[PDB]
């Protein structure tokens, strides 16, 4: 199934934060309405924050996370969770290799902000 794609309410600010846990350099692209709105590139084997940014979900609210390492797309897993009918988390993990820890880039989207 498609992973890393989330429908947000329109015209809503959301946070996006990426952590790295891999020998490979992670390139995280965050697309809003099918166009890149933020790009993070970093490398860590100890969960360093490689990027954090506030974005706006725009006209349609479609947000997509893509992760690549050395130009190759990583395999993604994802889900969205809502607490008290209000607080939203969109969660992404990714695997760039063979050990299937799925933490090589970890991306957390959260809204509302402010």
């Amino acid at each position: 199934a498609t992973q890393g794609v989330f429908t947000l309410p329109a015209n809503t600010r959301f946070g996006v934060t990426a952590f790295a846990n891999s020998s490979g350099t992670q390139t995280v692209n965050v697309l809003v309405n099918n166009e890149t709105a933020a790009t993070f590139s970093g490398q860590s084997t100890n969960n360093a924050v490689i990027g954090t940014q506030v974005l706006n979900s725009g006209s349609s609210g479609k947000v997509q996370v893509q992760v690549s390492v050395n130009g190759r797309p990583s395999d993604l897993v994802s889900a969205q969770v809502i607490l008290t009918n209000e607080l939203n988390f969109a969660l992404v993990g990714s695997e760039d290799g063979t050990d299937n820890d799925y933490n090589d880039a970890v991306v957390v989207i959260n809204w509302p902000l402010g």
């Binding site: 020998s23 490979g24 290799g97 063979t98």
Partner: peptide
Amino acid sequence: XXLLXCLXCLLK
């Protein structure tokens, strides 16, 4: 993790 899996691992 199989032939491709290995090749992937060796190339890294």
